[PDB]
Amino acid sequence: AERISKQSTPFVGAQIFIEPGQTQEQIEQWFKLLAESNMTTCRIRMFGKYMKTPSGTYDFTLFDRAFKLADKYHIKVYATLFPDTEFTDVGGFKFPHSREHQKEVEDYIKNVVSHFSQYKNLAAWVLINEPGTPNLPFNEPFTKERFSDWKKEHNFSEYNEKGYPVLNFEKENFIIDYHNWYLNWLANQVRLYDKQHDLHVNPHNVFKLSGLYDFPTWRTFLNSLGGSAHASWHFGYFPRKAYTVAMSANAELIRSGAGELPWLMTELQGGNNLYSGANPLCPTAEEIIQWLWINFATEAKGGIFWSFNARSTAAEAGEWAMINFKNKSSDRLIAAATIGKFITENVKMMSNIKTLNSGISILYNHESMWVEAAQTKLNNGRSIGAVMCSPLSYFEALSETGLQANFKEIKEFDFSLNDYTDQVIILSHQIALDNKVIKQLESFVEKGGTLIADGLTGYYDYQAHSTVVSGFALENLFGSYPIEYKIKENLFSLDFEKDNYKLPAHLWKGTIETSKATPIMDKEGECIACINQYGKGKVFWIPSPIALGARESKDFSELSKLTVSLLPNKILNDNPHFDKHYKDVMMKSFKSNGTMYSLIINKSASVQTVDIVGGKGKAFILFANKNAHSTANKLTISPEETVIIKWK
Amino acid sequence: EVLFQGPAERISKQSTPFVGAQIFIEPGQTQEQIEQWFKLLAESNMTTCRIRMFGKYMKTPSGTYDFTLFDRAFKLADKYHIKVYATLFPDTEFTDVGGFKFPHSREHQKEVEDYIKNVVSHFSQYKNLAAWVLINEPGTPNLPFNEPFTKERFSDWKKEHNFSEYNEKGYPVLNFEKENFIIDYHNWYLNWLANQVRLYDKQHDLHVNPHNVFKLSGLYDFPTWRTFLNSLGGSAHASWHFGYFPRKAYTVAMSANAELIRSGAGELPWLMTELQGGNNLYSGANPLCPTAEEIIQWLWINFATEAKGGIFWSFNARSTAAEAGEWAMINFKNKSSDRLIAAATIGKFITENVKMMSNIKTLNSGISILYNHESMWVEAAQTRGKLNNGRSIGAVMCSPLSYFEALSETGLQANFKEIKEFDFSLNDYTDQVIILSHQIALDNKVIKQLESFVEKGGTLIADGLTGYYDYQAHSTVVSGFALENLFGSYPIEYKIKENLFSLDFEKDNYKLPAHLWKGTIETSKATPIMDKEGECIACINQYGKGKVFWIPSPIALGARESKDFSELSKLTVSLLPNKILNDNPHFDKHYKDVMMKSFKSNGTMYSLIINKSASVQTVDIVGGKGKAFILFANKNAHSTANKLTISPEETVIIKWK
Amino acid sequence: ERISKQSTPFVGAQIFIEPGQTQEQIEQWFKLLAESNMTTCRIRMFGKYMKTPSGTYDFTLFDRAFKLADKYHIKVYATLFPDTEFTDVGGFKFPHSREHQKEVEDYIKNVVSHFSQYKNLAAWVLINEPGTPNLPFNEPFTKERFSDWKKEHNFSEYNEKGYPVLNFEKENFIIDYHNWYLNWLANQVRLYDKQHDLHVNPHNVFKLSGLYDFPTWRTFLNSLGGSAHASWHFGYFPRKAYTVAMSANAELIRSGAGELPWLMTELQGGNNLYSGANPLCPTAEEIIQWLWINFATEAKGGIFWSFNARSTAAEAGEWAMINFKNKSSDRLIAAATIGKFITENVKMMSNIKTLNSGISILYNHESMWVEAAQTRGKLNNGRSIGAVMCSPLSYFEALSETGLQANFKEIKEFDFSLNDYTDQVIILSHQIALDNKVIKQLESFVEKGGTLIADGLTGYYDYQAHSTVVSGFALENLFGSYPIEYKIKENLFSLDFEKDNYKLPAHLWKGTIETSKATPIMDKEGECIACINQYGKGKVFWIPSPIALGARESKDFSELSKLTVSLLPNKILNDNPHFDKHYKDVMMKSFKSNGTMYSLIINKSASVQTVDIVGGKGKAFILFANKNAHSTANKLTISPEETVIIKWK
Numbered sequence A: 001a002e003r004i005s006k007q008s009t010p011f012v013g014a015q016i017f018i019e020p021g022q023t024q025e026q027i028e029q030w031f032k033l034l035a036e037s038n039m040t041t042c043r044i045r046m047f048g049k050y051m052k053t054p055s056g057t058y059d060f061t062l063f064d065r066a067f068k069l070a071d072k073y074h075i076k077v078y079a080t081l082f083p084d085t086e087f088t089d090v091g092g093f094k095f096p097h098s099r100e101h102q103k104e105v106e107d108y109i110k111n112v113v114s115h116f117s118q119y120k121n122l123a124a125w126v127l128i129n130e131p132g133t134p135n136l137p138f139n140e141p142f143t144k145e146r147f148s149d150w151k152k153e154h155n156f157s158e159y160n161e162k163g164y165p166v167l168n169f170e171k172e173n174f175i176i177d178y179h180n181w182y183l184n185w186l187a188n189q190v191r192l193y194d195k196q197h198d199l200h201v202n203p204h205n206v207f208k209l210s211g212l213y214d215f216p217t218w219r220t221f222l223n224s225l226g227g228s229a230h231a232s233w234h235f236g237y238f239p240r241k242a243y244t245v246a247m248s249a250n251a252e253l254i255r256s257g258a259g260e261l262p263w264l265m266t267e268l269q270g271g272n273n274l275y276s277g278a279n280p281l282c283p284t285a286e287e288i289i290q291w292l293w294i295n296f297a298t299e300a301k302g303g304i305f306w307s308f309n310a311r312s313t314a315a316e317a318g319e320w321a322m323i324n325f326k327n328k329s330s331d332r333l334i335a336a337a338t339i340g341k342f343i344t345e346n347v348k349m350m351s352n353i354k355t356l357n358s359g360i361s362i363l364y365n366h367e368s369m370w371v372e373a374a375q376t377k378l379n380n381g382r383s384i385g386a387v388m389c390s391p392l393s394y395f396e397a398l399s400e401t402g403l404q405a406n407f408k409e410i411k412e413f414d415f416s417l418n419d420y421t422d423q424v425i426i427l428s429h430q431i432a433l434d435n436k437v438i439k440q441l442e443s444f445v446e447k448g449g450t451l452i453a454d455g456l457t458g459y460y461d462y463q464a465h466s467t468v469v470s471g472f473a474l475e476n477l478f479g480s481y482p483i484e485y486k487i488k489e490n491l492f493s494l495d496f497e498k499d500n501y502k503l504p505a506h507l508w509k510g511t512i513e514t515s516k517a518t519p520i521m522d523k524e525g526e527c528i529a530c531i532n533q534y535g536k537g538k539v540f541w542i543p544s545p546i547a548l549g550a551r552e553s554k555d556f557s558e559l560s561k562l563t564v565s566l567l568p569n570k571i572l573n574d575n576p577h578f579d580k581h582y583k584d585v586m587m588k589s590f591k592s593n594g595t596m597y598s599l600i601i602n603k604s605a606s607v608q609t610v611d612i613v614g615g616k617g618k619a620f621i622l623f624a625n626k627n628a629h630s631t632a633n634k635l636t637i638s639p640e641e642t643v644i645i646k647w648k
Numbered sequence B: 001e002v003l004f005q006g007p008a009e010r011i012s013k014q015s016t017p018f019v020g021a022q023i024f025i026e027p028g029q030t031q032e033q034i035e036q037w038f039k040l041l042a043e044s045n046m047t048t049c050r051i052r053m054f055g056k057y058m059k060t061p062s063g064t065y066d067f068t069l070f071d072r073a074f075k076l077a078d079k080y081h082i083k084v085y086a087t088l089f090p091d092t093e094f095t096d097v098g099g100f101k102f103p104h105s106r107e108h109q110k111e112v113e114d115y116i117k118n119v120v121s122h123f124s125q126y127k128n129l130a131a132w133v134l135i136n137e138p139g140t141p142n143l144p145f146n147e148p149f150t151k152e153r154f155s156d157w158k159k160e161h162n163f164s165e166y167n168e169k170g171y172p173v174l175n176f177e178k179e180n181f182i183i184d185y186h187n188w189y190l191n192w193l194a195n196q197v198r199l200y201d202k203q204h205d206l207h208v209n210p211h212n213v214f215k216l217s218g219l220y221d222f223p224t225w226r227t228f229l230n231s232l233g234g235s236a237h238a239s240w241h242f243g244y245f246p247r248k249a250y251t252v253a254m255s256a257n258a259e260l261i262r263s264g265a266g267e268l269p270w271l272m273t274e275l276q277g278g279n280n281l282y283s284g285a286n287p288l289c290p291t292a293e294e295i296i297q298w299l300w301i302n303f304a305t306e307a308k309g310g311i312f313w314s315f316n317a318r319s320t321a322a323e324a325g326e327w328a329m330i331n332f333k334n335k336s337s338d339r340l341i342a343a344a345t346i347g348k349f350i351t352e353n354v355k356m357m358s359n360i361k362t363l364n365s366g367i368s369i370l371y372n373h374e375s376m377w378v379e380a381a382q383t384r385g386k387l388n389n390g391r392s393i394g395a396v397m398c399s400p401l402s403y404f405e406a407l408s409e410t411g412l413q414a415n416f417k418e419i420k421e422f423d424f425s426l427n428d429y430t431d432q433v434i435i436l437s438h439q440i441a442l443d444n445k446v447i448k449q450l451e452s453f454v455e456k457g458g459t460l461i462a463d464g465l466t467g468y469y470d471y472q473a474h475s476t477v478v479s480g481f482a483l484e485n486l487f488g489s490y491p492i493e494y495k496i497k498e499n500l501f502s503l504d505f506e507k508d509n510y511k512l513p514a515h516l517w518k519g520t521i522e523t524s525k526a527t528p529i530m531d532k533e534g535e536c537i538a539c540i541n542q543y544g545k546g547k548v549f550w551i552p553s554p555i556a557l558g559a560r561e562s563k564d565f566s567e568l569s570k571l572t573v574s575l576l577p578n579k580i581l582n583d584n585p586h587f588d589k590h591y592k593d594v595m596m597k598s599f600k601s602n603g604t605m606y607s608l609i610i611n612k613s614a615s616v617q618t619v620d621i622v623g624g625k626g627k628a629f630i631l632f633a634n635k636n637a638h639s640t641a642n643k644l645t646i647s648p649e650e651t652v653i654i655k656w657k
Numbered sequence C: 001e002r003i004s005k006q007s008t009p010f011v012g013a014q015i016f017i018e019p020g021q022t023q024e025q026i027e028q029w030f031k032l033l034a035e036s037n038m039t040t041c042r043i044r045m046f047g048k049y050m051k052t053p054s055g056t057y058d059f060t061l062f063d064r065a066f067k068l069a070d071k072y073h074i075k076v077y078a079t080l081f082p083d084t085e086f087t088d089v090g091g092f093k094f095p096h097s098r099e100h101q102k103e104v105e106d107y108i109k110n111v112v113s114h115f116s117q118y119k120n121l122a123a124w125v126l127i128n129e130p131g132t133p134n135l136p137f138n139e140p141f142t143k144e145r146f147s148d149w150k151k152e153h154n155f156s157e158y159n160e161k162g163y164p165v166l167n168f169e170k171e172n173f174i175i176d177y178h179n180w181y182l183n184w185l186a187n188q189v190r191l192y193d194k195q196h197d198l199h200v201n202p203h204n205v206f207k208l209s210g211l212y213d214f215p216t217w218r219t220f221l222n223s224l225g226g227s228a229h230a231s232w233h234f235g236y237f238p239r240k241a242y243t244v245a246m247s248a249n250a251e252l253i254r255s256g257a258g259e260l261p262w263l264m265t266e267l268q269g270g271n272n273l274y275s276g277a278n279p280l281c282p283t284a285e286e287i288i289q290w291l292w293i294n295f296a297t298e299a300k301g302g303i304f305w306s307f308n309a310r311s312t313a314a315e316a317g318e319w320a321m322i323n324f325k326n327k328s329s330d331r332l333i334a335a336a337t338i339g340k341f342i343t344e345n346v347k348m349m350s351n352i353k354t355l356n357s358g359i360s361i362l363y364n365h366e367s368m369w370v371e372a373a374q375t376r377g378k379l380n381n382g383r384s385i386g387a388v389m390c391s392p393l394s395y396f397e398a399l400s401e402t403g404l405q406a407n408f409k410e411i412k413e414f415d416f417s418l419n420d421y422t423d424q425v426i427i428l429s430h431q432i433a434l435d436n437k438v439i440k441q442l443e444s445f446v447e448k449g450g451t452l453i454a455d456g457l458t459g460y461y462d463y464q465a466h467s468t469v470v471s472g473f474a475l476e477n478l479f480g481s482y483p484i485e486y487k488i489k490e491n492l493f494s495l496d497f498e499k500d501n502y503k504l505p506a507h508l509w510k511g512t513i514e515t516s517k518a519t520p521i522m523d524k525e526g527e528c529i530a531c532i533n534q535y536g537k538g539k540v541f542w543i544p545s546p547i548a549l550g551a552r553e554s555k556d557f558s559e560l561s562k563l564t565v566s567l568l569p570n571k572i573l574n575d576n577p578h579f580d581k582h583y584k585d586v587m588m589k590s591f592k593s594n595g596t597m598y599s600l601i602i603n604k605s606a607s608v609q610t611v612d613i614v615g616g617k618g619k620a621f622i623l624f625a626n627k628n629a630h631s632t633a634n635k636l637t638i639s640p641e642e643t644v645i646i647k648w649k
């Protein structure tokens, strides 16, 4: 069996939804049209409920029929392990209920994997669909016992080294280790019966659930990392006109989690919300093309849509499907097919995509989210999600300048190199940093790194103890000390001395006293920011939330201008970007075998002319779904259009 | 039925209608206050009261019953020739405003048995007793599945009912065990109360007042209730039950609430047991003090819809805690508010026109707006309990209510019926119309009935997600569309849009407001209708002698969300059989915030007209026969030919000569 | 020294002591506190930070703080605060169990025996922020105490006349349980220390006043405290009226205190980051406003929470008057100007007495209890919890914008036993519950010359939620009239009087009446909406529409001000300094010290205002002004956010 690699040819595919009641004729209609739509791959939920007989023995007939029809039309299968559960459980249970239930799951895996491993068209086991839940069942006897056990193996003091009170976040650290444990245990159960096939898993709702996910530990037992990125469930932090930015960030976040492993998007929205979804929609054809290009330009090795055909009963009946109710192509499948086709006509290019790293990394950490949950309310600086919305705003501001940026958990960043010249780290409202990471940040800047920090970055440590109160742990690196935070309106202006910038800011104004660092003053004569030279590199610190400020004002233009002014000149010379900020336009570049490309998407209401500067060579338009044209390096791109430029 | 009836009134479809009010009896009241109430009730041309027979105010420490407090009230009613609707109301907490809806326990069921034995044995002996109300406001949004009696009755119910997790074809299903149990449990307890009363009194009418009917209709099997009731009641409180409407459309609300009870009643007569008589202070969801104009509107709408009475809550007020000095028609000196003076003008009109008011029959246009329990049950499962709109609880009722409103503003009667209350057994349905507006659940059995109805000449109008699911929440739209035969077409996609969008038709530049979802179809036998974008959005199928119009976008919820039913009125009129518009009086065109409904009495035709607009309106009435003569008008309306000039808030009855 | 109504007032602040802090940091705090003209601190005596594994007490951490306070001549309010979870910010309000009650006995014995020995100890705070909306009826100690309470109290389900009743067992138990536990704490302290003042700080008083029997508390306290935090307690007001809020909060505690002196134990000293319901950072201008409003209302001190901040979790680096380098914020520099003014005017500031206009705005527990039962717990407005307090607070605001003092009292804190009430005024604004006993006291008050103003649903119910309006109006005698109807209307409507003199905003309900002895007042629509009754030497004005809630909802108190002034005895307007007319967002309140009269004026508007002060005697001289106010004759020109003290010569 073919193992996936960073050189595999990317695929477009879709969920094939198998339940009892379906006829051989309907199932074949689906696989035939899937193959005709230039799709290579399906995913199939291996429902234990539809394989278990009254007596307890397994009947594989319903799924044999589907696997055999996939094989006939040369379609390879991602098979999701999905034990018996309530019919009304849409997404599946995330952990065993009990020791008795764990044994039902052991028996389920033995039966399913032993049988279905024999099909030559099996491409992967999905160990579990959508691992992680906001609310873990601490009520249930299995989780209660595993948390009790976990606490006895971990010693915690109620005070720190200096004698101050601390929080230890026993619950949050247990939850990380419990996810690590059960996914590793599922991988091991599969490996008892099949060592030949790729192990995959699709983390979801990542801008809220990232605090459950230790992606570096997962790399030890996975072959590839998946994701669900549903416009209707996961992008609540954005308007629809910025789902481009949402999909870009979601992709960057999984890519970072994947590390040395290849990644793909296991779940994209293929169809209409009727009664389902939190932010319901029907993706436009234009949106299908945007989502596929953003994923592939971000190194994705596939895009699987949920779903090809629809469920028939209760939750989500006749929703999410790419085919209409006569089993023919919606404009969404016609659009997905144009991308399948582009791939088979440009195999060498699409098989070898590497993101063009600007060298900008936007870092988030679990501990900032844990501390925020303890200090806060659901809306905003004083609510759950500011610690993610803040980095997402820098991310958006850089997208509207046409620059790539990574989006990583801080443990996924490599702090071991000897040189970080022309590398940039943005810590936007990462309210919790400990001594160990401050040393890594000290090392990074010393060796040439640029560090940009805003909002309440470093206010607390990993124990929710504030060094701002006891003795500021970042005084050395920042070359300055915080004085006050004063709360203001939801939205206020930081007006810099000599009219250099008027910056939107959210909720709190910070004042500092500089020691080694160069002060920056506002028109009111207060010190609001500084630049510290620290070894070969530099630090820009502005302890007002200017990122949440741009988000709340719905204008990222001033955050874009400031951030560009702080970037090493090498980033702007070597990477294609926009001559200035463009509201609701995105660009992201990539390489394949030494050739550079640029993805451009216009999400504005009007035709835009973007001046692309930096990079090398003449823009040739390789892909454009609404007849964009270029004069020199000025691209004229229509609303909702996706453009790939090949630089010659 | 006549030896068993003896001297007691059997109410009938020929009974003389009454106006009446709740007389609120609690300890502390004096003989002088109680008499003041009954005296003024009689002087206000009211013939009837209702009295909550509080077990709490009759039970003694020892357990024996003391009837003194209620004897005093019944005797004073009899003195002023006032007949009593007596509500069975066992002992409960003082703070329990509406009363418990089911027994708590087997022990509690026996307290209720003993309560009924004592109260009915005693009070059946008064000659002025007109009716037993078996229970006040049967049904609750939230049933007590916690309590041991309900838990045991649901357990028992499930053991007597076998359900498969799959249908005939092999597909997964929901069975709605909870919802079907709740129907059968209401049927059971009301029937059991009726049987307890019948052990001791076979002479008097059994009555019950279902409430909040636009939300609670999925608890109510009215056809089964007919087996043990003599009349069907209702509560229709402007402050509790009309949340789906603004105040200026409480006319439409009261009209639909009346049509809904009338349909439930079938061969039984009905009356409105509970109307709002007075002011909300701290109580009510949408608080108000009814205007005099509103009291007259509500009474005429009910009588014109075959009601045999209107009982106001309340004549006098409660004195302590919940609703103290609220709801009363008398002021705090025990004299007439403008609300009682208004109610009295209607009592008087009745006693001066007895033959006419005793024989009212609604003039059926032949238009029937049908709802079903199962559409409400499936909606509750799909929306998972959101509360605002297509994607929330109540779209399945608001959609039919929009058609109903649009027909009211055209001056046409329409029935409002649960699908099981419609008669599908006739051989001819020429010039009959069925509207299925967003009835999202239809099974095979009912599709056959609809096929039969259209075949034999019926017109079927369907919009929104009608027929998307079956009674098991399985969607035939996905597996094989069960309505393909009747509609002569198949659905293609639903695409969600804004809260409010426009359906722009290919021809005549013509525009429908629509809510939430755009539906597209492929026609086989039916004639397609296309939009400007070249997609098929509606069709007309000729099926036997009758026709089907299908438009799977919600155009009814579309009119409701846009607060304009003018285009829904014009479209619906254009689909109607010509016979309906020739034989029934209606408006020459749509009139915003005006309502008309016609009725007959012994071969003479009448029309009720109410202006809820801000300005004097001149309505041209066409259809029917003869000269409009103004029989009733509370603000000096005049008519030149068939053009009525009617003032804001005015109620007019026209007699056709 | 024991506190008295002649004690010199102090400015002070919480000193927050927890493990981890160094001797050098603690000293920096006390040194700067002394340099900021502050004489006093409060210290939470955390049981958690004194208990050893073995169970014995180690006093080291607090010895260090007490000794450093003594070095800088700073006296200590010591809050009893037994062992509790680190995450419990405000502390438990009652013992969890009989076993827990014994841990608290042992805690008090150890802490009081030890710390009573320091010469700089000024007071024991028996418990921080007594009172909780929701009591732990779950927990075995409270369950047993409520069971016991019910067995000692017999209630009938009916009244004397035979009518059903509510008895409010829960609400009356809660009063008696607060009385009991605070008295029990006072007695435990007195086993070991009879030499030091006992203090307690009630909080969120506009919501929690129904938990507080202040007259009973006087029996065992030496002084009454209060928390009045802008970020937690002033939800019924916008920020531009926190002046009015602090004024009413002060009047409410002063009234509770009676013959006892009072002080504000907890004021907001600093910034909300993640904490607070209505978050802010007090301006320097706001610090000065709050201190002057409290002292002008007889406060003997203002203690800010906090001098220095907590370091971990809840409120870490929040609330502090010092910045993160341990130097003065503009808030501490402002507080210091007031400490300094005191030490330079000791005779004046030591003897402040409020100048009683004679206007008393009365609220009662029972109106709040009945409202909670009738609204069934809606939270927005006449049909929601808080109307019974918002209504009196609106009269209070309207009188503030006229420059008149008013008392704000629970009805049991008003003295009904005098023989003369000439030129005294009582306002009952939407006090929906009055019993026969209090109606007799009101009858007596008016007979003997009192003016009674009543609006909204005053007297609609009795203390058992029985409505005499329905059964036989208990206020017919005093009002000389009977209610006819209440009709619900819009949120906001206009009562337009027959005479073209008053158009009054009104909320929710229109009341109509029939007059017998009283003189009717008609509206343009011909309905009787109000009356004046002459009753003995005094008068009653009744208008049963809510005109106070009406002003609040319309954000205009100008018409309520003009009407109320027109009803006042001439003597109040001649003897008390007030404004020539209503001024939106300006407040004045006068006070005396040893026969000299003063006036506090605060401008909360966006612009310079010129207020004509009339009434009183003599020449306005500016004694205090933080933004160069001037007066020409009796016309004060006062800048936005400015606080002015006038000395009348």
Ligand SMILES: *[C@H]1O[C@H](CO)[C@@H](O)[C@H](O)[C@@H]1F
Residues within 6 Å of the ligand: A090, A091, A129, A130, A228, A230, A267, A276, A306, A316, A320
């Ligand atoms: C991902 O999301 C889709 C859309 O709700 C689900 O149907 C699948 O179960 C999976 F959970």
Ligand SMILES: *[C@H]1O[C@H](CO)[C@@H](O)[C@H](O)[C@@H]1F
Residues within 6 Å of the ligand: B097, B098, B136, B137, B235, B237, B274, B283, B313, B323, B327
């Ligand atoms: C109908 O509604 C009235 C008015 O609220 C209630 O008071 C009665 O109990 C009856 F339920």
Ligand SMILES: *[C@H]1O[C@H](CO)[C@@H](O)[C@H](O)[C@@H]1F
Residues within 6 Å of the ligand: C089, C090, C091, C128, C129, C227, C229, C266, C275, C305, C315, C319
């Ligand atoms: C008064 O207020 C402060 C601020 O929230 C609290 O920290 C203290 O515990 C006291 F409750």
Ligand SMILES: [Cl-]
Residues within 6 Å of the ligand: A043, A044, A045, A046, A080, A129
């Ligand atoms: Cl799956």
Ligand SMILES: [Cl-]
Residues within 6 Å of the ligand: B050, B051, B052, B053, B087, B136
């Ligand atoms: Cl009743």
Ligand SMILES: [Cl-]
Residues within 6 Å of the ligand: C042, C043, C044, C045, C079, C128
């Ligand atoms: Cl304290």
